[PDB]
Amino acid sequence: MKTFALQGDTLDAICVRYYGRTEGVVETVLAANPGLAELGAVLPHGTAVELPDVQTAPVAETVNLWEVEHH
């Protein structure tokens, strides 16, 4: 279960949008998504980050981001 990160949609936000907290979770996503701890600042729109310890199906949110052809 990974989603494309965007402006104001980094782990700091996602973690709160899915789990609703950063304490204890930021460490998890770090192990599942290595090298992301080097970025620091906001992530580049399109970052593929996986959400560990997450159930199937989408999450409570509103958005219709559709895109399959980028090349």
PDB file of C-alpha atoms in Angstrom:
ATOM      1  CA  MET A   1       0.000   0.000   0.000  1.00  0.00           C
ATOM      2  CA  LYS A   2       2.094   2.886  -1.328  1.00  0.00           C
ATOM      3  CA  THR A   3       1.050   6.377  -2.419  1.00  0.00           C
ATOM      4  CA  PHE A   4       2.668   9.154  -4.451  1.00  0.00           C
ATOM      5  CA  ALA A   5       3.859  11.841  -2.037  1.00  0.00           C
ATOM      6  CA  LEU A   6       3.086  15.475  -2.851  1.00  0.00           C
ATOM      7  CA  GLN A   7       3.169  19.017  -1.466  1.00  0.00           C
ATOM      8  CA  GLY A   8       2.267  18.835   2.211  1.00  0.00           C
ATOM      9  CA  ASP A   9       1.687  15.109   1.771  1.00  0.00           C
ATOM     10  CA  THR A  10       4.968  13.820   3.199  1.00  0.00           C
ATOM     11  CA  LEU A  11       5.305  11.106   5.844  1.00  0.00           C
ATOM     12  CA  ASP A  12       4.653  13.767   8.482  1.00  0.00           C
ATOM     13  CA  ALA A  13       1.201  14.231   6.955  1.00  0.00           C
ATOM     14  CA  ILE A  14       0.481  10.764   5.569  1.00  0.00           C
ATOM     15  CA  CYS A  15       1.362   9.190   8.917  1.00  0.00           C
ATOM     16  CA  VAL A  16      -1.301  11.425  10.459  1.00  0.00           C
ATOM     17  CA  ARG A  17      -3.707  10.836   7.574  1.00  0.00           C
ATOM     18  CA  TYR A  18      -3.477   7.059   7.956  1.00  0.00           C
ATOM     19  CA  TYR A  19      -2.352   6.213  11.489  1.00  0.00           C
ATOM     20  CA  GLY A  20      -3.019   9.656  12.927  1.00  0.00           C
ATOM     21  CA  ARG A  21       0.360  10.002  14.622  1.00  0.00           C
ATOM     22  CA  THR A  22       4.100  10.280  13.983  1.00  0.00           C
ATOM     23  CA  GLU A  23       5.528   9.025  17.277  1.00  0.00           C
ATOM     24  CA  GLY A  24       6.300   5.341  16.822  1.00  0.00           C
ATOM     25  CA  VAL A  25       5.273   5.327  13.166  1.00  0.00           C
ATOM     26  CA  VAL A  26       7.977   7.518  11.635  1.00  0.00           C
ATOM     27  CA  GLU A  27      10.397   4.759  12.630  1.00  0.00           C
ATOM     28  CA  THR A  28       8.381   2.092  10.817  1.00  0.00           C
ATOM     29  CA  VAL A  29       8.056   3.871   7.471  1.00  0.00           C
ATOM     30  CA  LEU A  30      11.793   4.513   7.764  1.00  0.00           C
ATOM     31  CA  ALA A  31      12.603   0.798   7.758  1.00  0.00           C
ATOM     32  CA  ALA A  32      10.165   0.147   4.912  1.00  0.00           C
ATOM     33  CA  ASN A  33      11.383   3.180   2.966  1.00  0.00           C
ATOM     34  CA  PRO A  34      15.167   3.545   3.405  1.00  0.00           C
ATOM     35  CA  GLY A  35      16.993   6.541   1.968  1.00  0.00           C
ATOM     36  CA  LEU A  36      13.989   8.770   2.608  1.00  0.00           C
ATOM     37  CA  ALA A  37      15.497   9.942   5.897  1.00  0.00           C
ATOM     38  CA  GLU A  38      18.125  11.759   3.833  1.00  0.00           C
ATOM     39  CA  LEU A  39      15.651  13.987   1.993  1.00  0.00           C
ATOM     40  CA  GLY A  40      14.702  15.885   5.135  1.00  0.00           C
ATOM     41  CA  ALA A  41      12.635  18.710   3.668  1.00  0.00           C
ATOM     42  CA  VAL A  42       9.406  18.139   1.741  1.00  0.00           C
ATOM     43  CA  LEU A  43       9.397  15.181  -0.649  1.00  0.00           C
ATOM     44  CA  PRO A  44       9.254  15.541  -4.458  1.00  0.00           C
ATOM     45  CA  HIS A  45       5.751  15.296  -5.920  1.00  0.00           C
ATOM     46  CA  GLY A  46       5.677  11.686  -7.082  1.00  0.00           C
ATOM     47  CA  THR A  47       7.636   9.942  -4.338  1.00  0.00           C
ATOM     48  CA  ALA A  48       6.644   6.282  -4.044  1.00  0.00           C
ATOM     49  CA  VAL A  49       6.371   5.548  -0.321  1.00  0.00           C
ATOM     50  CA  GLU A  50       5.017   2.294   1.106  1.00  0.00           C
ATOM     51  CA  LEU A  51       2.689   2.226   4.114  1.00  0.00           C
ATOM     52  CA  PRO A  52       3.674  -0.688   6.390  1.00  0.00           C
ATOM     53  CA  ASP A  53       1.244  -2.103   8.951  1.00  0.00           C
ATOM     54  CA  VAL A  54      -1.699  -0.960   6.828  1.00  0.00           C
ATOM     55  CA  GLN A  55      -4.870  -2.816   5.849  1.00  0.00           C
ATOM     56  CA  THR A  56      -6.230  -3.208   2.319  1.00  0.00           C
ATOM     57  CA  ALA A  57      -8.647  -0.743   0.725  1.00  0.00           C
ATOM     58  CA  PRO A  58      -8.101   3.039   0.521  1.00  0.00           C
ATOM     59  CA  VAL A  59      -8.166   5.527   3.398  1.00  0.00           C
ATOM     60  CA  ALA A  60     -10.679   8.155   4.507  1.00  0.00           C
ATOM     61  CA  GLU A  61      -9.876  10.990   2.101  1.00  0.00           C
ATOM     62  CA  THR A  62     -11.092  12.932  -0.935  1.00  0.00           C
ATOM     63  CA  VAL A  63      -9.071  12.996  -4.155  1.00  0.00           C
ATOM     64  CA  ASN A  64      -9.323  11.915  -7.793  1.00  0.00           C
ATOM     65  CA  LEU A  65      -5.676  11.786  -8.871  1.00  0.00           C
ATOM     66  CA  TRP A  66      -5.663   9.727 -12.067  1.00  0.00           C
ATOM     67  CA  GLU A  67      -2.530   9.112 -14.134  1.00  0.00           C
ATOM     68  CA  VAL A  68      -1.105   6.009 -15.812  1.00  0.00           C
ATOM     69  CA  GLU A  69       0.895   7.424 -18.721  1.00  0.00           C
ATOM     70  CA  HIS A  70       3.788   9.658 -17.666  1.00  0.00           C
ATOM     71  CA  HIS A  71       6.588   8.573 -20.005  1.00  0.00           C
TER      72      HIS A  71
END
